[PDB]
Amino acid sequence: NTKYNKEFLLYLAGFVDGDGSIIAQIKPNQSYKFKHQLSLTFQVTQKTQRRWFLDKLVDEIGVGYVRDRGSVSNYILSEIKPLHNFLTQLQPFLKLKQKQANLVLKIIEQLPSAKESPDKFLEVCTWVDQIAALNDSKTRKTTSETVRAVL
Amino acid sequence: NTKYNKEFLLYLAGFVDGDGSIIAQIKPNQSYKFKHQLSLTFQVTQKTQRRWFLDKLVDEIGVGYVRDRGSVSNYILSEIKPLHNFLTQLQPFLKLKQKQANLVLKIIEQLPSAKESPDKFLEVCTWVDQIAALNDSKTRKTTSETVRAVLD
DNA sequence: TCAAAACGTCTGCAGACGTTTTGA
DNA sequence: TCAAAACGTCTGCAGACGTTTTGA
C-alpha cells in the first residue's frame, strides 16, 4: 500500500472538492448471482488539450488511467483496493465530498458480505442510493428498489 | 494584508486549479480617460444549495463576497489590493492557473503607470489578451486591438 | 475619472450516470 | 460469477465573458 505525501493530499482534496466526482453504481448484469454488479469510480475531467495534467495524476497517484472521449478526457480509478487506500488517506482533508468518500469506503469493506445474504446486498445498494443523492444525479435508472423488485 | 497558512493555500490552490476562474477584461466605458475600464476578477461557482461553502470561504479568505444568481452562486473577489495579496500567496502552489495568476499580478503593478500614457495602457491590454487566451474564451468582444483603434 | 458593484447572456459542455465486453 | 475495462450520451447549467450603475 503506497502512502501519499500530505502536501499532495491537501492540494488533491481541494481539487477533488471542486472538480472531482465520486460515483457509485448498480449495473444490471445477468452474469452475477444477484443479477447486478456493484461498481465504484473516482473520476476527474480535463479538456483534451490539458491531458498532460491527467497523465501526471496517473504517475503521482501511481494507479488508474486516462480515457479520451472527444472534446474532453477523464482520469479514472476503479480498482477496489487502490481506491480504498486512496480515499482512506484523502478523506480527512475533504470538505464537500467527504460523505461520498466515507459511503464508498463502507461499501468496499462490506463487499464480501454483500455476496451472501440477498438482504446484505440489498442493504449495500441503499448506501449506493445515498451517494447519488449527495451528488447532482440526473440520468439515474438502477436503484435499490430496482434491485429489491428482483429478489 | 492578511497572511495565510500553508495548509489553507495548498488546499485552496487545488480547488482553484480545478474549479476557479481568473478573469481579466477591457470594458468599454466613456467615463474613463482611455474610454475603457481595466477589470480583474477572481470567481468560483457553486449550486446555491451549497452557498455555505462560499460563505465559509468569504470568512477564511477575509475578503470578497457572494452573489446568488438564482440556481448558482458566485464567490467574487474584485478588489485590487486584496486580489494581489491573495494571488501572490497562492501563486506558487498553482499548477494550472498559475500563468493567469502571474499575468494578473503583472497587470496590477503596472496599473498606475498604465493610466499615464496610452502606450503603456495599450501594452497592459496585451496582457489581458494573454489571459483570455489561456482560458476557454468564447464570447470575447473588447480586446487590445479595439482599444488601439479607439485611441486613434 | 476612477474602483468596485450590480446585473445579463449562452451553448458547449461534463458530472454522473448508462450498457456491453474482456478476461479471468 | 466476479473485477475492471471499454465505450455511449443526457440536461442543467456555468465559465467567461458582456453592459450598466454606484458613489467618492
- Identify any residues that bridge with B23 across adjacent strands, giving them in sequence order: B41
For residues B97 and A14, give the distance between their C-alpha atoms in angstroms, rounded to a whole number. Answer: 14
For residues A135 and B75, give the distance between their C-alpha atoms in angstroms, rounded to a whole number. Answer: 21
Encoded amino acid at A113, one letter: S
Number of domains in chain B: 1
For residues A60 and A63, give the distance between their C-alpha atoms in angstroms, rounded to a whole number. Answer: 8
All residues at 6 or more sequence positions from A150 whose CB lies less than 8 Å from its CB, including other chains: A34, A35
Q: Does residue B20 carry a catalytic annotation?
A: no
Which one-letter DSSP state was computed for residue B12? H
Nearest to B19 by CA among A15, A45, A113, A77: A15
Q: By three-state DSSP, how is residue B21 classified?
A: strand
Nearest to B79 by CA among B104, B102, B110, B97: B104
Q: Where does chain A have alpha helices with state H? A: 6-19, 51-61, 80-90, 98-109, 111-114, 118-134, 144-148
Buried b (16+ CB within 10 A) or exposed e, B25-36: bbeeeeeeebeb
Q: By three-state DSSP, how is residue B93 classified?
A: coil
For residues B59 and B11, give the distance between their C-alpha atoms in angstroms, rounded to a whole number. Answer: 16
Q: What are the distances in angstroms from CA B28 to CA A102, B1, B125, B147?
A: 50, 31, 12, 9
Binding residues of A for Mg(2+): 18-19
- Report the Cα B117 to chain-centroid distance in Å: 23
Nearest to A73 by CA among A88, A59, A53, A103: A53
Environment class of B58 (CB within 10 Å of its CB; exposed 0-12, middle 13-18, buried 19+): middle
Q: By three-state DSSP, how is residue B37 classified?
A: strand
Nearest to B129 by CA among B26, B21, B35: B26
Encoded amino acid at A2, one letter: T
Contacts of B92-98 spanning 24+ positions with Cβ under 8 A: B93/A11, B93/B9, B93/B10, B93/B12, B93/B13, B94/B13, B94/B16, B94/B17, B95/A11, B95/A53, B95/B13, B95/B17, B96/A50, B96/A53, B96/B17, B96/B18, B97/B16, B97/B17, B97/B20, B97/B22
- Strand D: which residues 14-43 of B lie within 7 A (CB)? 19, 21, 23-29, 31, 37, 39, 43
Task: Please answer whether residues B103 and B24 qualify as being in contact, where contact means their C-beta atoms are separated by less than 8 angstroms.
Answer: yes
C-alpha radius of gyration, chain B, whole number? 16
Measured between CB atoms, which of B10, B15, B17 is closest to A7? B10
Where residue A67 falls (left for φ over 0; alpha for ψ -120 to 50; beta otherwise) is beta
For residues B145 and B149, give the distance between their C-alpha atoms in angstroms, rounded to a whole number. Answer: 7
To the nearest 10 degrees (0 to 180), the angle between helices B80-90 and B6-19 is 100
Where residue A113 falls (left for φ over 0; alpha for ψ -120 to 50; beta otherwise) is alpha
For residues B62 and B42, give the distance between their C-alpha atoms in angstroms, rounded to a whole number. Answer: 14
Q: What are the distances in angstroms from CA A64 to CA A38, A80, A83, A135, B112?
A: 18, 11, 9, 22, 49
Encoded amino acid at A144, one letter: S
Task: Please answer whether residues B89 and B9 qualify as being in contact, where contact means their C-beta atoms are separated by less than 8 angstroms.
Answer: yes
What is the span of the domain harbouring residue B29? Answer: 1-152
Chain A positions touching B50 (Cβ under 8 A) are 96
Size of interface A-B (CB pairs under 8 A): 55
- Report the Cα B37 to chain-centroid distance in Å: 13
Strand order in the sheet with B65-68: B20-28, B36-47, B72-77, B65-68
Measured in angstroms, the CA of A18 and the nearest CA of chain B are apart by 5
Which one-letter DSSP state was computed for residue B4? -
This entry's atomic model was obtained through X-ray
Resolution (A): 2.5
- Identify any residues that bridge with A41 across adjacent strands, giving them in sequence order: A23
Q: Angle at CA A133, nearest 5°, toward A131 and A134? A: 65
- Report the Cα A34 to chain-centroid distance in Å: 21
For residues B71 and B89, give the distance between their C-alpha atoms in angstroms, rounded to a whole number. Answer: 31
Which one-letter DSSP state was computed for residue B139? S
- Tell me if chain B has a CB within 8 Å of the CB of A7: yes
Sign of CA dihedral A112, A116, A121, A124: negative
- Report the Cα A30 to chain-centroid distance in Å: 22
A7: domain CATH number is 3.10.28.10
Give residue for cell 468569504: B58
CA neighbours within 13 Å on the CB side: how many for A137?
17
Task: Please answer whether residues B101 and B22 qualify as being in contact, where contact means their C-beta atoms are separated by less than 8 angstroms.
Answer: yes
DSSP structure string for A88-118:
HHHGGG-SSSHHHHHHHHHHHHTHHHHTT-H
Q: By three-state DSSP, how is residue A67 classified?
A: strand
